[PDB]
């Protein structure tokens, strides 16, 4: 699977880096959040924490999925801005 960053965007008010990326998986299924996070952090020098994946989406026939990710400066601002359902869905918090 390849991961190709299409856009990065900066937010000073909430203190976040928004990231739009494409995933290329020709012949394979839709990949997993763990793997996508590993690749993202390895490639952009980010913390495995303070990083969440809002969605990975597949289309009708593409073998090319899309993603949206957010990288925060501080775990505190993170837990304050982001709701709990994505945190549980990612694994950064135990319900």
């Amino acid at each position: 699977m390849e991961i190709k960053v299409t856009e990065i965007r900066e937010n000073k008010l909430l203190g976040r880096k928004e990231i739009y990326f494409d995933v290329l998986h020709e012949g394979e299924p839709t990949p997993s959040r763990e793997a996508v996070k590993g690749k993202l952090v390895a490639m952009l020098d980010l913390d495995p924490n303070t990083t969440v994946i809002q969605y990975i989406r597949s289309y009708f026939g593409s073998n090319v999925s899309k993603g949206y990710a957010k990288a925060y400066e501080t775990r505190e601002r993170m837990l304050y801005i982001e709701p709990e359902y994505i945190l549980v869905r990612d694994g950064l918090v135990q319900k």
């Binding site: 937010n11 000073k12 008010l13 909430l14 304050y80 801005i81």
Partner: protein
Amino acid sequence: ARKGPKRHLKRLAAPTSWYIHRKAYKWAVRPSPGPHSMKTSIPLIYIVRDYLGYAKTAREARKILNEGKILVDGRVRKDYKFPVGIMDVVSIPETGEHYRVLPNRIGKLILHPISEEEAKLKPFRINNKRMVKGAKVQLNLHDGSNHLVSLAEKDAYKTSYTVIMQVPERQIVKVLPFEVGAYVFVTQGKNVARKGKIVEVRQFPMGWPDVVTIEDENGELFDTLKEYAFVIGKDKPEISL
């Protein structure tokens, strides 16, 4: 049957001056009473969320608003219902961004980016005059605001002139009159967002408003109403359009 005032607003019934999706949902933010009208203003949350894109939901927008990270006319505004309007200035000092609110040739409101120097001035149109106790003159402006002046200098302020003012402290500079060579910016009607110079005024009897003719720099002439002709300069503009 209705026993009182309204507190909701549906999206199919929202004014046309807005950039909004009408079928995505059923409900819209009803603005609160304030400076401008409903047909001439848009709340702040729509700016924070749908124009600039600093938030995707409304909780995030409320959160940034309740921390003084956004100003309007040099003042902090925490209410997501506050109506923003024409000739107003939106300032984000954490990103160095300054926008001025203006309409299009279509009638919709937009954000024109300006500089920090011009972000400290706001033009006002004198809409009426009154004499109040202490024998003082009260000018009633176009955003619903008011200014006090002495009697000695009453003949210098009339009911269509324009006044430039430092926004937060609200001190006057550079009055501009309504004459036959003044620069103009139309704010409503069929010829909205056009610009040009005045040529002729015309009056009518028994309640009908006054009309004015204007010439654009391509040389073409067009008429409109006198209350729609915002004065912004003498020979050239003082702000950015």
